[PDB]
Write a protein that binds this ligand. Structure first.
Ligand SMILES: CC(=O)SCCNC(=O)CCNC(=O)[C@H](O)C(C)(C)COP(=O)(O)OP(=O)(O)OC[C@H]1O[C@@H](n2cnc3c(N)ncnc32)[C@H](O)[C@@H]1OP(=O)(O)O
Ligand SMILES: [Cl-]
Length: 276
């Protein structure tokens, strides 16, 4: 009769739905299932899930498991338009995003979101090539004197005159302490303000998903995100972390930056997005 919100203590019951290589390598999906990062899980049957909506609220939901699930066919719309919607909007969000592994889920999701003026896209997935990065980074533009690099610590996050960073981190991490213990991040600073950041938004074991941004529109295209990422990726290499970059096909600034940093294209997944 409805999709059921799953308690975190039962998340292990959906692990068996993570089966293909693309599913297994998807850091946000696994980070939410592991309980490590912020998200919600909805299932057909809380005792023995056969299909799940895994909402990595900072980035996308995923539909996994059996696309023929009758309850998903009749009540996926109800879950989107009330339970997902209300928690998104109350938390300052505006959008629904879904990412699919399996063509069979497309018609199921399309019937559920049909009246929405949704935008189809694809999410690009990569593999980081450390040797390429180490070769090509010598060509990156050096920072001029007004710009410096700082590792994200509690002082930086709590004293950003804009709560920009704190707000972004809250999409992914239940606390700043959890981010600082389990993740890492670096910023470009100018006039004592955070201009760019590169940080871990999800963790699955030694796999870290990247979030990058240059917040000051007028400072883009100067090499700032590149340098925040370069320091981040060096940290990852030094500490045995595999970084992951996934981005919408239409976000060509991000697609091109990923290629510049030594991320190599591997596969793409269909996405759907609308504004509530
Ligand atoms: C993995 C993820 O985080 S996915 C989400 C990515 N982040 C966002 O979408 C947030 C909004 N966008 C941004 O903040 C910025 O556009 C960013 C972070 C993608 C890039 O920040 P910038 O500070 O402008 O990047 P930076 O100047 O260091 O690098 C430019 C590189 O990025 C790509 N790029 C940047 N702008 C463009 C553009 N108009 N067109 C094409 N490629 C571009 C190019 O590879 C360019 O290479 P170059 O240095 O050889 O010219
Ligand atoms: Cl597979």
């Amino acid at each position: 009769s409805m999709l059921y919100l799953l308690d975190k203590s039962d998340y292990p019951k959906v692990k068996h739905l993570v089966r293909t290589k693309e599913e297994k390598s998807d850091v946000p999906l696994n980070a939410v299932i592991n309980g490590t990062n912020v998200g919600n899980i909805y299932v057909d049957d809380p005792d023995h899930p056969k299909a799940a909506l895994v909402d990595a609220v900072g980035t996308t939901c995923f539909l996994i498991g059996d696309a023929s699930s009758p309850v998903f066919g009749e009540h996926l719309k109800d879950c989107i338009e009330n339970q997902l919607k209300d928690q998104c909007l109350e938390s300052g969000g505006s959008y629904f995003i879904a990412t699919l592994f399996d063509k069979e889920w497309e018609k199921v999701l399309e019937n559920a979101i049909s009246h929405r003026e949704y935008e189809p896209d694809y999410e690009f997935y990569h593999e980081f090539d450390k040797d390429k990065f180490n070769k090509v980074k010598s060509n990156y533009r050096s920072l001029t004197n007004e710009y410096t690099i700082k590792r994200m610590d509690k002082e930086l996050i709590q004293n950003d005159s804009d709560d920009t960073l704190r707000s972004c981190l809250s999409d992914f991490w239940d606390s700043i302490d959890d981010f600082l213990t389990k993740g890492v991040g670096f910023c470009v600073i100018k006039d004592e303000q955070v201009i760019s950041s590169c940080f871990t938004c999800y963790v699955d074991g030694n796999n870290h998903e990247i979030s990058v941004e240059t917040y000051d529109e007028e400072e883009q295209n100067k090499g700032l995100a590149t340098k925040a990422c370069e320091v981040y990726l060096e940290y990852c290499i030094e500490n045995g972390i595999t970084p992951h970059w996934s981005t919408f096909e239409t976000n060509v600034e991000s697609v091109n930056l990923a290629s510049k940093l030594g991320f190599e294209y591997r596969f793409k997944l269909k996405t759907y997005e609308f504004e509530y």
